Design a protein around this ligand. Structure first.
Ligand SMILES: *[C@@H]1O[C@H](CO)[C@@H](O[C@@H]2O[C@H](CO)[C@@H](O[C@@H]3O[C@H](CO)[C@@H](O)[C@H](O[C@H]4O[C@H](CO)[C@@H](O)[C@H](O)[C@@H]4O)[C@@H]3O)[C@H](O)[C@H]2NC(C)=O)[C@H](O)[C@H]1NC(C)=O
Ligand SMILES: *[C@@H]1O[C@H](CO)[C@@H](O[C@@H]2O[C@H](CO)[C@@H](O[C@@H]3O[C@H](CO)[C@@H](O)[C@H](O)[C@@H]3O)[C@H](O)[C@H]2NC(C)=O)[C@H](O)[C@H]1NC(C)=O
Ligand SMILES: *[C@@H]1O[C@H](CO[C@@H]2O[C@@H](C)[C@@H](O)[C@@H](O)[C@@H]2O)[C@@H](O[C@@H]2O[C@H](CO)[C@@H](O)[C@H](O)[C@H]2NC(C)=O)[C@H](O)[C@H]1NC(C)=O
Ligand SMILES: *[C@@H]1O[C@H](CO[C@@H]2O[C@@H](C)[C@@H](O)[C@@H](O)[C@@H]2O)[C@@H](O[C@@H]2O[C@H](CO)[C@@H](O)[C@H](O)[C@H]2NC(C)=O)[C@H](O)[C@H]1NC(C)=O
Ligand SMILES: *[C@@H]1O[C@H](CO)[C@@H](O[C@@H]2O[C@H](CO)[C@@H](O)[C@H](O)[C@H]2NC(C)=O)[C@H](O)[C@H]1NC(C)=O
Ligand SMILES: C[Si](C)(C)CC[C@]1(CO)NC[C@H](O)[C@@H](O)[C@@H]1O
Ligand SMILES: [Cl-]
Ligand SMILES: [Cl-]
Ligand SMILES: [Cl-]
Length: 847
């Protein structure tokens, strides 16, 4: 009965420190570890639920689950309903609910044979999901008891391997440790550090299977939760409320798992083109005059800058929807001038609204009070916390009236200052005091029978009371959606205020956030450790459908070094969202504030990113239309090479661009993994050391002096490029170029998506140009998928072909010898001058 292998023991005392006698009285096994592993664990006979009256339906199964012996938690739900829905060949969906009471549910919009088969264990109850093709057991919930109590759900499963990623937001390797790891999902304001619940919660994992197939599991549950991983290997979901709403995504390819997950939670939003340019911010740009000098200093030193930002500086006494009449007296003129120069403007918005101002003197509060927009306490009055302005009320973004109020406050402020998006901070929501000015009542929501592993050991720590009232439910159920609901509110407000694509960057997130907004990783230290950690974290958010993600380039807290800021700018130029942001008390870290050689390296990083923008924009189009990742781990692109599985200090842009950054001080080289194939050094492509790495799938040491970041182009791919500019307003008017990386057999393929860069409903209206590029048998051609006014008249002026073994005797464009070409025998690069249009069929040939 108690003869269970150490790694397969599930904790029978997750709630408290227990003695042997108490453990044995619960009906559990007490065996101390020999040095973590639970001492008190479930025998195989521990009372679970029994399956009864299993019945078949069109599109699935239903059953009753019955528990006859109570658990050690209060309020077991003794009778449950199981619903199994076989939704698509790729997507299995099951719920476990209380048939006698509607419980809290997360608000979410909804040869021939499935990839899965499903079976059930009768007693103890379990759901068993096989991969049909190879019989692999993906889900087996029979491994531990089902707990289903009012404030405690636990469902466990075997894992198919030791390789599992997901369960944001935490500072972790991309692949999570199965060594008795407790991962806590409770949105929390805390500087990224390992083992802590951070700003967001994504209850989704992708699990790798031997051979390179994968599946995903989504628990649609927004309650405070722990996820416990153990080395058997196995996983336990432990939630403090709601229901069990489980999706299984059968892949079989890791890229298909992510797409299938995003079919449920939403495809990433399409950002404006300008959103992919460089962003520059700090706390301490304390006047329009200082803020204007940033743009002047960047422009003087030839550094691209699309978007100037301000932090709290612009506000009147740190209040939303105000600007002070000292340093920011001419705020509106500053933003209009930025626009005249072809730049955009972003500023910080906090959720909490100053509640202490004289009545009638501060419209956001006064109108919020009138319309009942705020989270309320026991007596129906606004819950009052403390944030930057002092005493504050907290908008309830589940209240439709709050959405209307937020739209009005954003539109009215935009009529004063035409800002181009919203930086939504502190939306955990973050509170400077515990719960409220008035503390919190003593009830089961504030003091629940199971408290997950949250920093501070309470649901109230750094946030508002758990028993506070929102339109849809208590904050207890809704806390992990606070940031997401604000992001939805802000997305709609910006659409109504500006009539073009919204640009929202949010601190706090939940599953499906990417449908509305991007994310930055928060208060990272200016350290080599946090630079290195930003790579796994940016990859993790791409797997979770938030591709518009980055870290504060050169780090946020503390003082950067020139060397760290060179390496951080080099790597950060490959963040899909690229912003340099800096704390109030920090030494300056704008590119122009460093030595001449450091400026050259930073300018080169920005030049290359701007040259690549048409490509990065096309990668976002694929994310938006097909649920693809933008920045992706090697294992997503080469899952059948098991050597890629633990690589998280390299990243790809899409299928073709491999980035191998230096992430350590004092290094003049970097060792990176190169999947099987040829990888061309991007340094061999002209933009305004081995030329090719021929890998069998192996580790390769690369020269990486201070002025270099290693970037390689995969053979068989074509990348569109565009000429330079200090803004995308300038760069989008330049001639374009192609970089063509030939296979040994002379083949390559690539594409370009182009639209006006900011309109709504572009794909629905067909207001875009889509072109495919094909290299074959010493020819390059375009294939016109769609050609419209927007994209017709893009000029192709340069074609660079990599892996051309022999100097050609002649190079033809549309049957005429070209004006000019060069061939380099040492690099195998053929550089061709042309006068072609992306939107008009061409043929470039050489021999
Ligand atoms: C729900 O939220 C509301 C706010 O929307 C919150 O109202 C607050 O209630 C407390 C009382 O519990 C108020 O505090 C009082 O403030 C007045 C005037 O500003 C003071 O003079 C009062 O002093 C008396 O009580 C003291 C206790 O420390 C005594 O020592 C003293 O001698 C006085 O007898 C007292 O501090 C507070 O003003 C309001 N806040 C606002 C914004 O009106 C309400 O309490 C919340 N409900 C729950 C159950 O949490
Ligand atoms: C899903 O997980 C469940 C529970 O872990 C697995 O069922 C368990 O399987 C073990 C090993 O197969 C069983 O122990 C064996 O019992 C047989 C029958 O008497 C005996 O001959 C063996 O020597 C051993 O004792 C165990 O009874 C069983 N547990 C339960 C609760 O049924 C199951 O195999 C997993 N399913 C799949 C498809 O992987
Ligand atoms: C399992 O189901 C049986 C039978 O339920 C009946 O048939 C079902 C398809 C459905 O249409 C029900 O409405 C029917 O009642 C349950 O046993 C019945 O229990 C009811 C209510 O107590 C009683 O009136 C009948 O005499 C029982 N019928 C038989 C054949 O035993 C049983 O309770 C269900 N089990 C659980 C755990 O819910
Ligand atoms: C970040 O650095 C500031 C400033 O450091 C000083 O000024 C720089 C130009 C450089 O020359 C440094 O070596 C200098 O020491 C730190 O703020 C200073 O902190 C000290 C000690 O706490 C204080 O006594 C000084 O007056 C501060 N000076 C200024 C000009 O603000 C700050 O502590 C650094 N942050 C961290 C986390 O180390
Ligand atoms: C923009 O650059 C200007 C010129 O370098 C900076 O102004 C100088 O700042 C130094 C401090 O390092 C002062 O000693 C000088 O008096 C200033 N020089 C001039 C020419 O005025 C300015 O600080 C930079 N501003 C920002 C916002 O980065
Ligand atoms: C940690 Si602080 C320097 C006291 C506070 C910083 C700020 C101030 O708005 N709020 C939190 C955000 O994460 C920061 O990016 C932001 O600059
Ligand atoms: Cl008004
Ligand atoms: Cl509810
Ligand atoms: Cl290896």
């Amino acid at each position: 009965q108690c003869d269970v292998p150490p790694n397969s023991r599930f904790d029978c005392a997750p709630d408290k420190a227990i003695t042997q006698e108490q453990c044995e009285a619960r009906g559990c096994c007490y065996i101390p570890a020999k040095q973590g592993q639970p001492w008190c664990f479930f025998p195989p006979s521990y009372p679970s639920y029994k399956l009864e009256n299993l019945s078949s339906s069109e599109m699935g199964y239903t059953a009753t689950l019955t528990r006859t012996t109570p658990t050690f938690f209060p309020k077991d739900i003794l009778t449950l309903r199981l619903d199994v829905m076989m939704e698509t060949e790729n997507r299995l969906h099951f719920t476990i609910k209380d048939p006698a009471n509607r419980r809290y549910e997360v608000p979410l919009e909804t040869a021939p044979s499935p990839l899965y088969s499903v079976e059930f264990s009768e007693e103890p109850f379990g759901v068993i999901v096989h991969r049909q093709l190879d019989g692999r057991v993906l889900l087996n919930t029979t491994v531990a008891p089902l707990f289903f109590a009012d404030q405690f759900l636990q469902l466990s499963t075997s894992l198919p391997s030791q390789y599992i990623t997901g369960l944001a937001e935490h500072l972790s390797p991309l692949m999570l440790s199965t060594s008795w790891t407790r991962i806590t999902l409770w949105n929390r304001d805390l500087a990224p550090t390992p083992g802590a619940n951070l700003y967001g919660s994504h209850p989704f994992y992708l699990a790798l299977e031997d051979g390179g197939s994968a599946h995903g599991v989504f628990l649609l549950n927004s309650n405070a939760m722990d996820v416990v991983l153990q080395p058997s290997p196995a996983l336990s979901w432990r939630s403090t409320g709601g229901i069990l709403d489980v999706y299984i995504f059968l892949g079989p390819e890791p890229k298909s798992v992510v797409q299938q997950y995003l079919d449920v939670v939403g495809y990433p939003f399409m950002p404006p083109y300008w959103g992919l340019g460089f962003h520059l911010c700090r706390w301490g740009y304390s006047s329009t005059a200082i803020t204007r000098q940033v743009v002047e200093n960047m422009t003087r030193a030839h550094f691209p800058l699309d978007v100037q930002w301000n932090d709290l500086d612009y506000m009147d006494s740190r209040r939303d929807f105000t600007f002070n009449k000292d340093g920011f007296r001419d705020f509106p003129a500053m933003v209009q001038e930025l626009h005249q120069g072809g730049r955009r403007y972003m500023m910080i918005v906090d959720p909490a609204i100053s509640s202490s101002g004289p009545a009638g003197s501060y419209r956001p509060y006064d109108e919020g009070l009138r319309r009942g927009v705020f989270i309320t306490n026991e007596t129906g009055q606004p819950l009052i916390g403390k944030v930057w302005p002092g005493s504050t009320a907290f908008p309830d973004f589940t209240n439709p009236t709050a959405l209307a109020w937020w739209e009005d406050m954003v539109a009215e402020f935009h009529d004063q200052v035409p800002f181009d998006g919203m930086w939504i901070d502190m939306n955990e929501p973050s509170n400077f005091i515990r719960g409220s000015e008035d503390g919190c009542p003593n009830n089961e929501l504030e003091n629940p029978p199971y408290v997950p592993g949250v920093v501070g050991g309470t649901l109230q720590a750094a946030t508002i009371c758990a028993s506070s009232h929102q339109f849809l439910s208590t904050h207890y159920n809704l806390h992990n959606l606070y940031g997401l609901t604000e992001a939805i509110a802000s997305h709609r407000a910006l659409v109504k205020a500006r009539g073009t694509r919204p640009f929202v960057i949010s601190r706090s997130t939940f599953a499906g956030h990417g449908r509305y907004a991007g994310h930055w990783t928060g208060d990272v230290w200016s350290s080599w450790e946090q630079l290195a950690s930003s790579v796994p974290e940016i990859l993790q958010f791409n797997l979770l459908g938030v591709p518009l993600v980055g870290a504060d380039v050169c780090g946020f807290l503390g003082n950067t070094s020139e060397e760290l800021c060179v390496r951080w700018t080099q790597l950060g130029a490959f963040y899909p969202f690229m912003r340099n942001h800096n704390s109030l008390l920090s030494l300056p870290q704008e590119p122009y504030s460093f030595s001449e050689p450091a400026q050259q390296a930073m300018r080169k990083a920005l030049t290359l990113r701007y040259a690549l923008l048409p490509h990065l924009y096309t990668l976002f189009h694929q994310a938006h239309v097909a649920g693809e990742t933008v920045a992706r781990p090697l294992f997503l692109e080469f899952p059948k090479d098991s050597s890629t599985w633990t690589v998280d200090h390299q990243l790809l842009w899409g299928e073709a661009l491999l980035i191998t950054p230096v992430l350590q001080a004092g290094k003049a080289e970097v060792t990176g993994y190169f999947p099987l194939g040829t990888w061309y050094d991007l340094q061999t492509v002209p933009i305004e050391r081995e030329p090719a790495i021929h890998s069998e799938g192996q580790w390769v040491t690369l020269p990486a002096p201070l002025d270099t970041i290693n970037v390689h182009l995969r053979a068989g791919y074509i990348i569109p490029l565009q000429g330079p500019g200090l803004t995308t307003t300038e760069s989008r008017q330049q001639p374009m170029a192609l970089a063509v990386a030939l296979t040994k057999g002379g083949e390559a393929r690539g594409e370009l998506f182009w639209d006006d860069g900011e309109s709504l409903e572009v794909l629905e209206r067909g207001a875009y140009t889509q072109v495919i590029f094909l290299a074959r048998n010493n020819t390059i051609v375009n294939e016109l998928v769609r050609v419209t006014s927007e994209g017709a008249g893009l000029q192709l002026q340069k074609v660079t072909v990599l892996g051309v073994a022999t100097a050609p005797q002649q190079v033809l464009s549309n049957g005429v010898p070209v004006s000019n070409f060069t061939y380099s025998p040492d690099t195998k690069v053929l550089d061709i001058c042309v006068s072609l249009l992306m939107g008009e069929q061409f043929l470039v040939s050489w021999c």
